[PDB]
Each structure stands twice: as structure tokens, then as C-alpha cells.
Amino acid sequence: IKEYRTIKEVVGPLMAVEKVSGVKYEELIEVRMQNGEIRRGQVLEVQEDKAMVQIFEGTSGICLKNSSVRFLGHPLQLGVSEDMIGRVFDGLGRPKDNGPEILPEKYLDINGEVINPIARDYPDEFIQTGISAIDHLNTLVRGQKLPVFSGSGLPHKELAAQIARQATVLDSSDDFAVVFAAIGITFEEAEFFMEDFRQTGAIDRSVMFMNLANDPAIERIATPRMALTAAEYLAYEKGMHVLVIMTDMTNYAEALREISAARREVPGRRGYPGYLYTNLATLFERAGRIRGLKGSVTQIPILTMPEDDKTHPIPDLTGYITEGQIILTRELYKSGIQPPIDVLPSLSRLKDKGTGAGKTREDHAATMNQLFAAYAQGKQAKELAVVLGESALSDIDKIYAKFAERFENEYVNQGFYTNRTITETLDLGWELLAMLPRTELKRIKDDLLD
Amino acid sequence: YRTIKEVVGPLMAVEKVSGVKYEELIEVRMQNGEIRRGQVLEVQEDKAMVQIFEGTSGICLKNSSVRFLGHPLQLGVSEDMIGRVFDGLGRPKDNGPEILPEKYLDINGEVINPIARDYPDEFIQTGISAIDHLNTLVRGQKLPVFSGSGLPHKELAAQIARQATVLDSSDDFAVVFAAIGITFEEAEFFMEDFRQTGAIDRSVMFMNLANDPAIERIATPRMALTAAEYLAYEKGMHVLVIMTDMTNYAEALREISAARREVPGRRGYPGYLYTNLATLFERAGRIRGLKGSVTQIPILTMPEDDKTHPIPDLTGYITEGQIILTRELYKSGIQPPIDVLPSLSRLKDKGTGAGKTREDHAATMNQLFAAYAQGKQAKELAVVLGESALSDIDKIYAKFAERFENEYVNQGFYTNRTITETLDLGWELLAMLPRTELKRIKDDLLDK
Amino acid sequence: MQIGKIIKVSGPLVMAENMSEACIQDMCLVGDLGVIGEIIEMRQDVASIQVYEETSGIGPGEPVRSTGEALSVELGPGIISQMFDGIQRPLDTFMEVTQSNFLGRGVQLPALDHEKQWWFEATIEEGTEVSAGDIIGYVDETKIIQHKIMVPNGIKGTVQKIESGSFTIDDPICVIETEQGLKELTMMQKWPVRRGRPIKQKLNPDVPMITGQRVIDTFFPVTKGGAAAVPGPFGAGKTVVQHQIAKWSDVDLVVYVGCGERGNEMTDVVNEFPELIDPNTGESLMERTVLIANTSNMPVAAREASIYTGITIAEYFRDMGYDVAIMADSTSRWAEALREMSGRLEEMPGDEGYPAYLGSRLAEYYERSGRVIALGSDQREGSITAISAVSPSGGDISEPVTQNTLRVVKVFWGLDSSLAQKRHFPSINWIQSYSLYSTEVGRYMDQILQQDWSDMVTEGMRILQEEEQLNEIVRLVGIDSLSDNDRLTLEVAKSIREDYLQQNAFDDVDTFTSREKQFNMLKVILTFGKEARKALSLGAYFNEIMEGTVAVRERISRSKYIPEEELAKISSINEEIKETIQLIVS
């Protein structure tokens, strides 16, 4: 570790250190201030005996003449270990639960590696989230990236915590770990997850990376990378099935935009950096399975859509990298729908690989199609009249409408603390159907044994 | 100094200087003997950047010289400024005797201590029923007028400039009129109108034309305010300040901002437009312990008639309400055209009521405002319907609405309606309404 | 002292050389006039300085002095009852020293009175080990608030010398024995406003703040350490609500912050606030509050540092173990100052001109409020509850400032001009307003009242939203078309709206409603609907119920005006309800 007291200049969040040697790009630094205060930093640029670094905690209060800079000789790394399970961490990977520090097995670059295309393996099998609206018709598969699109008003934090508890692989002898990443959330929101995780005992199988809204923007960007580096360690080195949940990705993009402005870079679209897509892709591609290895990495990125716009560069690019999305609407939520998932606009591209007779009741593929069709037509009749007098609908158009209604209140409205097994989910969806006539159908001819 | 070493655009560079200060005035002695005033924009170790007011054309660097006056833009203030007309720099444009200033003041002024400021309590009779009753102007308030190009706001300004009076009647009402980047015909319209009605003998006019230098266009408002504060806070006068056109002032900031190659702010205007506008508009109000007062009525034209535009948006965000002129009413023939709906006055409560106005001012204001809103809705809703709404039930609202717009708001730009007349016209137009529509007060029978 | 020299002056930007020992964000005195400035960049030895005041008449060659510290506030006796600007300059003292009605540039004034003699009462004994936050003594600063003198952060050791007596805030009142030798302590301590004062631990704000305003305490309550936002449109009576919260609330001290407001509007605050009376003492409210005042005309840095100056002072009394309420009005005008400072720094334009770190700055502000365990061996608690005014032009809550605020606050009191025009006060929209403390506050209320209060609240709100749907049915069309059960729900909603939600701040008894009184009031309104509903199922009819309950409904209407001393006159209404309804059932 090198230490210089030759800090030449300070402009904004950036410092210039001269008469330096052996310094590398993206190297971590420490600023030891005259007051004895310490701040982390990163080498943005090195040029012929000079180093431009950016300070995470800012540059306010720094005295150039009486300050020193330590070059750590490495970038941002995570001290990955098995002891991380049941522990709570910084966005920088530092203990946040006042427990004993972890003696790391090794240190890994939080940027991770790029998987060889021929080394990558297609994803299965099914993952039970205990939430029916998700297991069909928007099924989650091991190694998939299935994001949730929400809004500021909506309760994604509740949905996020419910999945972390109810997530599991039935049945499997392999371990199922959960890596939870909180990005730029308030103390009370973070305290919520912490309180829920320990109340239910879900923390015993989880690794939490907690980044707060008043933490440095840099630590905000590093948070999801700290999590994924841990997830891949447990998955591909420990053979665990890891589920990574991240919120809020909207805050992540803002930190990218915030940091990009500090570095005085021209914005591509909506003020966001042109490499926002490339920066989301760097994150979202760090999921899946490896041939020959037991473990897997599944991602559930949760983000709030600014102004409820899906064409926004944040959810737009995410949609371009994630295979499907779970949509939450205010119309449902305002109607007391929990979770308020609109299964219509929602999608799961890899669902067909998770809904397997070996993995899920064969009723599922058909039942899902039937349930969708029935709800869809049900909602529509209501949607127009509505304008026309609803009254008693022409023929069974009223019947469409009415079972759509029951559909929201008992199928989707399971409750944020009710864990439905995939078998129970299938029966209920059918229970709507049994109430429908055998006459109207998209369903299987062998309505048996059930 | 004969050390001019650069001249780029309206900017010049002078070397070997010492003791030069920021915003210091300078004179350029040209080779031909011509003199041009300038302002210091930036001072470096040995050099200074200055911008010449009358431009930079025809200047010989080697044969020209620069001299630093040792002071900024100042205004020669005197009570003799009453009835006199000036340019944007406060120089006589009436061929009258050169006023002997009591003292020279910087046109920037100073911020009033918030605990030294006094609340607006006095009502100002503009003679316009639409304003005086519906959106009252109070002594010490800043109440702007929002208009569009080609509209009679110029006519409205002069009307208020003539009819403006204080019911108290003392000590004495004064009008500081600032013209900003307006055409000759507009300026000439004001000159003749003021001298005709004799309003000039009560006014101090600063005239800046549209073909005048951009810099002088910026100093104009500050010249007027400096004089206004002098007459008020040193002479104990109640000065009513009228300024047009503030939209021209904003465009003048862009021309300078660009000439000084500054980074464009939102919507194409400088990032310091808010504070630059506030530094002007916040120079009004009453001071505790002082007799005088300064009241402002900025007039601006709205680009594309858009209210979300930076000019009218930042202005209303600084001023306490606004008077709005529409294009529908003007073509409709209304004078002055004033949609009282979007109009607002944030201090109309502190200037009205018994003691300063009649007892039914607050009541009739709310009634005319609510009752009208339904009249405008009817005629608009009447189109799609035909209308389906049965006039048997309702209503003469439209007729009252129409006549109100026709007879209340439309009074002419040469009609002075005292607050007594305005309130009377309220009931007579409110007379169409029945007891079923509550004002509501037992005083309704008091004024019938 | 190391003195620099101005080498450049371009607008608000001043560059000075010979500033090698300067620090970033350090305050400076620029030029002969010594105008206030802040170090923005270091070279070194050339420092870039953003000047807060006018730089007119300043040039190269003139001196520059670093104060050696960042923007800080003086914390000690003499701060309470005072009115400051954004950087804590005493406005009244400013008028005395300058003999002027204006804020002249280059005028330097301490925030507090350094000549004033205070009596320091030592409560800690010599030989005691102390650290940051420990109380060594107190001062009876005002008629209401007792100023507690704490050990400054960075101090740790044993008390060598301590004694009571008359001192100034500059006199050493205590001597501490440290590793680094003896260190004198005074009654005042300085602290940088951009840095949150340290704490032992942050706690969840679950204890409800009693504002005494029925609509808030019941349906949209805020806890001690919670944060709330207010739209404050014109004519909605936002000022009267702020006054009600300020002088009735459970908190010990109030910190009002006016961030660059209109001159005449800021004048209202400065005059009307001292006129506010403290309910408990009868003293002026100012015996309990510190007030910041800024106009748009004033230096953008002061307007931008206004809320940070205030929150710092709030944190200071929080460390003492007090509950503080900090009101910021308007945070939308604060953001405007921030936006402008972004341009003067020539930063990349964020959303709509606002800096890319707008959301961050707001988060940093509100996260400095809340319930905490203060520093000190006694581990006392303190809280900062934030009430912020948001004022988007055109009243669009969709904009950046309001949007990011709602992203970090858990309470929203939607003031509505529509309700105001309908004579409904306070004009808080019960449909659009919300409080994410409702569940937690509800559990607290049930435990302290021994009642099913949370059920009563949800029932009342269920009725309110029940009304909004029935209202849509009345039009398109016909009030009469509705059933006797639906017609009853509307009247119960009328009750809740007029008998409960509407509150006259200017009435002697209706101005404040106790926690126990709110329970009884809502318990008589709901029990009227319960009996009426039970009656309807017993063959009773809506009209026969309404026309035969004009008297008892009269009492319910006057229930708000019933003195706290005779709450029994409210609970007895339930008897008259059960007795009258039973009479209708024949």
C-alpha cells in the first residue's frame, strides 16, 4: 500500500494526486484527512505520474496540504465466505449487524467475470415463490431474470419480503440461499426488511446487503455488484441455488446519473448516461447456470417506473435484458389487491421450462391458459360497460365479468403472508374453472384424476 | 490607459491595469475622438474584460484608449426627477435642464431586512373594477400583468398609470414608469398620453427602446427602482412602479449571457434568471418606521401564450399573484380583457374590508367569482349540447356572465371607476342572481 | 494568519492565490469589504471561491481570509427566541449594529450574544468521567426551555474543575482532563451544518405525535421522528395548519425554516409567529422556537443552507433529550436555490434543471430526522419530526421536488383549494392523503386507550371511501334511488366530515382535541351508525330514523365544543343514541 501527501488539486468530488507511481485504473484509495477522518476513493484516471481519484463521501472539509492518500493496490472486492449467511452488510460489504467480522476465504472483484457462451447452461427447474400469480402464469425458473415493475405508491417492498421467505425449490437436496440487496432505501424501509427477515427466521438462509438513501452514490452502484459477487460465490463454488433480490433499481439508475454528472459526462437519453443499458446488462447477465456445476443464480430486480411510464429508459432497458416482467398496477392495489399483480400485461418468457410434469402438476400449462383466457374476457366485458349499462350482460358476457371478479379476490389476493404451494395454486385456479362450465374451455380433455 | 490588446465581439481586453474593480464603469477614447461607455465584466491579474454599450464597431485598438471611472452604474437622484423623462441609463430625453443630483446611488440597491419589512395594509385604487374588487392591489405588493403580443396591455399600463390613487390621499402618490425594449410608437404612445392627461407631472419615466443596447436594456429596471426607492424611503412618497416589457428584459439577459458565453440554463434561459428577477421584484414593499412605500406592477408578454414558459412562471413564482389578459376577450371587444379566473392577488385580504374599503367587498368578490365560473362553463358546455341544459332552470348566468364580461370587466381604458362604483356595479350585476344563490349575508338586503 | 490575494473576479466567482492552507467548503472573507464566501476548488495554492454577496467593486490585489471552518452554527444559550437568516445571522442584531433596514454586504456578526451573562448551574461533580453528549450542567435560557450544556463531540475524559456562576458563552465553565491534556469547555459549541450530528443509535418512530387536530391525529397521524409533506396551495389555509401544529404539538422545541420566500409572505411569518401563544405557559411561542427567515432576494447560498442550518439546530436540542419539530417552508423554494447553485457551479443539468443529486440532498435532509438514542452515558432519547411544505408551480405533485420528497417521507397531508372553497377546514383531502404510520400508531393507541381504536379508524375511513363511491351514484343519477342503508352511510359520512374532520382552529375548545376526546367523539358518531344500521334491520326506516334523531344529532354536532374537563357529556351521548333508536323501534 502506497501513501502520498502530494495531493495537487481538488475540484468537486475529484482529487488530483501528483508525483505518484505504480497506480492503476479503478484502484481503491483511502483519503486520510488532517482531522483523522477516512474516506474511500477510486482511481478514475491515471496519466504520467498523476492520478485523478473520486471520493465516495465527497471532498468537503479536505485540506490538500495536510491530507494523504493511500493506494490500496486493488479495486472494490468482496471478502466472500460461507459465514456471510445470516449476516447483514454494507453496500461495500462491511458488517452492519455488530457481529464478528468474517474471515474471508478469498477476495473477488465485484465486477465478476463473463461466462463463456459454450459454458453457460439453459435454465431450469421451477422455483416456488408461494405466490400463485407468479408460479403460473408468470412462472419463475432457476437462472432466470424476472424483474418486478412497480410504482412509488405500490407495495413492492412487501412483495419483495414475501418472496424472500417463500422462495424454495421443492423438492431438492441442494441448499437454497437468498441474497437480498437494498439499494438507496430509507432507514425505516431497511429496518422493515431487517425486522421481517428475523421475525420469520428468513435471515438464517439469507445474505443482506443494505444500502441507504443517504449513503454515497458510489456505494449505491457497488451494492448490486457486491450482492451478485456473493451470489455467484455461493452458487458456483458452494453449489447453492441462490435467489438475488434487488430494490430499488430505480435508485441505482439515479446514482449512475448522479455519478455520471459529477464526472462531467454527456447524457445519452433522459439525462441518463448512454451506457445505462450496457450497465444494466453488465448486472442482469450475471444470472443463470453453468454446465457441470450444481448451483444457480436467479435474479429478481425490483424497480419503480418513473411517472408510471414503461417506455422510460430505466424499465425499457431492463426489459431489453430481462426475460419477462411482473407488473404491479395502482388500480388493483387501490382495490385492496395484494399483491396487486396484473397477470395480463405480465409475462415470463422462460415459464415453459419450469412448468414440468416432473416439476409442476400437468394441469398447470392448460390451467394457466384457461385462467388467463377467462379473466381476460371477464375484465373486458366489465371494461366497456362500464360505459354501456353493465346491467345483466348479454348472455354469459356477464359471467365472464363476474368470474374475473372472483379471480382477483381469492386467486390473486392470497395475502403478503400466505404461502401457497404450487399444488394448492393449481386446485384453486381450477376451482374457478369447476364453477365455469365444462362446455366453455381451452383446457385438457382428461379432467382427471382431479 | 492605451493598452487595449483585444476586441472580440462587444468585449474588449485591457492590460497593465491595477486597481480596476468588477462592474466598474469605463470610457473608451477612440482614435476619431468619439467616446463610448463600458462595463467591467471580469478582472484578472493584469487585464480586464469590458463590454462597450454602443458596440465595438469602428474601433482602432492601437489608437484608442481606455479610462476607468472608478465607480459602477449610478443614478443621479433628485426630487426634480418628477415630470422628467430619461433613457435606460437615466439621462434626460426631454431637452430639459440637467438635474443637479443630491447624491449618486448604485442601481443595484440592497436587500431589505425581513424583520425590518412591514406588511402591506393599504388599498390602491387603480380605477379598474376587475383588479380593485376581484384582485385587489395593495401598497407594497408586487402584482404583475400577464399578456400576449399585440394585446392592449400597453393601454392597460397607461390607464393604471393615470387612475392609480390612494384613498388616504397622502403623503403623495408617484409613478416611476420604466419602458424596456419597446418600439418607438409604444414609447411615443406613453409620452403623449402621460403629457396629455398630465400624469407626467406625477411620474418619473425611464424610456428604453427596442433598438437600444442590450446592456442598457438590463440596467433600465434597476435605474427605475433606484429612483423609486429614493422617492419612497428618503422622501416618504408612495411610488407605484410600472415596467414593460419584462419579456424584453429576459431576452436581453440571453443576448448578454450568450455574448459572455455562459452555459444555457433550462428552456434556453440563464440559470440565474430566478434570482435576477427576484432581485428586481423584491425591491418593493413597506419598511417599518418609514412613511414611503414601493409598489410594483411588472408587465410581461407570454411567449406562445404559454403559462408554463420560464418568463411568466418564474415571475409569478416571485410576485404575489398576477393579472391575466386573454386573446378571446380582446377580439370579443373587452377592455381591459381580464380573465379573473386565472388572475390572483395574494395580499387582497390585507388591503380590503371596512376601514380601507366597504363592508361587502369580501362577500361580493367570492360571489362574482363563483357565479361567473359556472357561466363560462355553461357557454362552453352549451356548444356540445346545443345546449341540453334548460335555460328555464338555468340560467341568466351566461347573460350575467356575458354582461359581466361585457359590462363589468369591459369599462374602457379611459374610465376611472372608484371602489364605491365598482362595488355598486357588483350588486346590480349580482341582482340577476336570486336569493337562492347565497352571497351570503344579511347585508344582502342592506345593499339589495 | 495566512492571508490570500485575489487574482481574479468574474461575477460571483473569485480566485485568490496564497491560499495553500485553505480547505474545501471553508468560509472566507473576500476583499477589503470582507464579503462572505466559500472555497469551492483548490489548486493549490489558488482557491476558487463562490461569493454569496455582491462582488461589485472588488478586484485583484485585495485580501482574502479563511475562517478556518465550514459553514457552522453557534450552539448555546441565546439561540432560542432568535430569528436568523439561512446562515444563522441575527436579523435584529444586524439592524442594531448597522443602524440600517437593509442587509449590507461585508457585515460580520456572531450568531449569539457573547457579552450576555447567563447563570450556569453545574449538575455534574468533579472527578466524573465524561464523553460527547454528557450533561455537565444547565441554563434556564427562556421562560419555557431549559438549556442543557453537553460535552462537545471529540471530548472525552474526567472533569477536573466545574462550578456554577455567572458566565458568558465564551467563559470556560468546565475543565476536562484528557489524554491530550486539560481542555476548557464553554457553554457554546460550533458544528458544520452539512454534517449530521452523531448519535448512539437510530430508532423507529412509533410514538404518535399529538397535534390535537382530529383529522391528522386520527387518519393521517405522524410519529415523533416521522416526516410529513404539505402541498400548501393558496387559500387552503396552510399557514393556520402550520400554526396549529407548531404550538399544540407534543414536541419541546420548534424550528421554523423559511427558505427564500416572498418578502411580504416571509413578513407574515416573522410577525405572526411571535404572536403565537404557548398553551401550557401562556408565554409567547418564541420562548420555545428558533426561526430561520430568507427571501428570494437574499443570497442563494443562504437560501440553500437554510434547511441544513435549521436541521443542525434541531439535532442540537435533540441531543439534549428533547422532541423537536422542524417546519420547512417552502422546500420547493429551497430546491430552486439548489438548482441555481448547480448552474453557477456549471454542473451537468439534471431533471428539469435540478441537480442530478437533488433526490440525494433531500434524502440526506430527512434521514437526519427521526427518533434516536443520543450520545451520553444516560442514553436518553430525542426526536426530530419534520413537517415540510412543498409548492410546485401549477400545483403539479408530479414534479421532481415533491416526487423525491414523497419517496422518503411516510406522511402526506393533501391540502386542497377545493375543500377550502367549500368551507371545509382544515382543508385536508381525506381521499388523497395518507400516513404509513397508521398501522403502528393504531397499535399504540389501542394499548394506551384500552380500546379497539384502530378498528374505529378503519371503519370511519371505510365510510369515507364508501361515500365517495355513493356520491358518484347520486349524480347519474338521483339521491333518492339509493337504499336506506346507503342513505344512512352518506349521513354517517356527513357526520364524520362535519362533526369530526372540520375543526375551527380559532375556537377556544375546538382548537385542540385531546387523545381521549377524539376517541369519544368518533365513538358516538360510529355508534350512531351502528344503532341506525341495527334499526334498519329491525324494520326501521331511514326517514323515521333521521326525523326522530334531530336532537341527538345536535349534541353530536356540538360535541367538538365540549370542554375536556367534562368528557362525560360526550360519552353520555351513546346512551341517548341507544335509548332514542330503541324508541323508534316499535
From Swiss-Prot, chain A:
GO terms for molecular function: ATP binding; proton-transporting ATP synthase activity, rotational mechanism. Coiled coil: none annotated. Belongs to the ATPase alpha/beta chains family. Signal peptide: none annotated. The gene is ntpB. Induction: By increasing intracellular Na(+) concentration. This is V-type sodium ATPase subunit B. The keyword Transcription regulation does not apply. GO terms for biological process: proton motive force-driven plasma membrane ATP synthesis; sodium ion transport. Keywords: Ion transport, Sodium, Sodium transport, Transport. The lineage of its organism: Bacteria, Bacillati, Bacillota, Bacilli, Lactobacillales. It holds the Pfam family ATP-synt_ab_N. InterPro entries: ATP-synt_VA_C, ATPase_a/bsu_AS, ATPase_F1/V1/A1_a/bsu_N, ATPase_F1/V1/A1_a/bsu_nucl-bd, P-loop_NTPase, V-ATPase_su_B/beta. SUPFAM superfamilies: C-terminal domain of alpha and beta subunits of F1 ATP synthase, P-loop containing nucleoside triphosphate hydrolases. HAMAP family: ATP_synth_B_arch. Involved in ATP-driven sodium extrusion. It comes from Enterococcus hirae (strain ATCC 9790 / DSM 20160 / JCM 8729 / LMG 6399 / NBRC 3181 / NCIMB 6459 / NCDO 1258 / NCTC 12367 / WDCM 00089 / R). The keyword Transport applies.
Curated annotation (Swiss-Prot), chain C:
PROSITE patterns: ATPASE_ALPHA_BETA. GO terms for molecular function: ATP binding; proton-transporting ATP synthase activity, rotational mechanism; proton-transporting ATPase activity, rotational mechanism; sodium-transporting ATPase activity, rotational mechanism. Induction: By increasing intracellular Na(+) concentration. It holds the Pfam family ATP-synt_VA_C. SUPFAM superfamilies: C-terminal domain of alpha and beta subunits of F1 ATP synthase, N-terminal domain of alpha and beta subunits of F1 ATP synthase, P-loop containing nucleoside triphosphate hydrolases. It comes from the Bacteria. Its EC number is 7.2.2.1. It catalyses: 4 Na(+)(in) + ATP + H2O = 4 Na(+)(out) + ADP + phosphate + H(+). One of its GO terms (biological process) is proton motive force-driven plasma membrane ATP synthesis. GO terms for cellular component: proton-transporting ATP synthase complex. It is an enzyme of class 7 (translocase). ATP binds at G232, P233, F234, G235, A236, G237, K238, T239. Signal peptide: none annotated. Keywords: ATP-binding, Ion transport, Nucleotide-binding, Sodium, Sodium transport, Translocase, Transport. NCBIfam families: PRK04192.1. Involved in ATP-driven sodium extrusion. Belongs to the ATPase alpha/beta chains family. This is V-type sodium ATPase catalytic subunit A. It comes from Enterococcus hirae (strain ATCC 9790 / DSM 20160 / JCM 8729 / LMG 6399 / NBRC 3181 / NCIMB 6459 / NCDO 1258 / NCTC 12367 / WDCM 00089 / R). The lineage of its organism: Bacteria, Bacillati, Bacillota, Bacilli, Lactobacillales. The gene is ntpA.
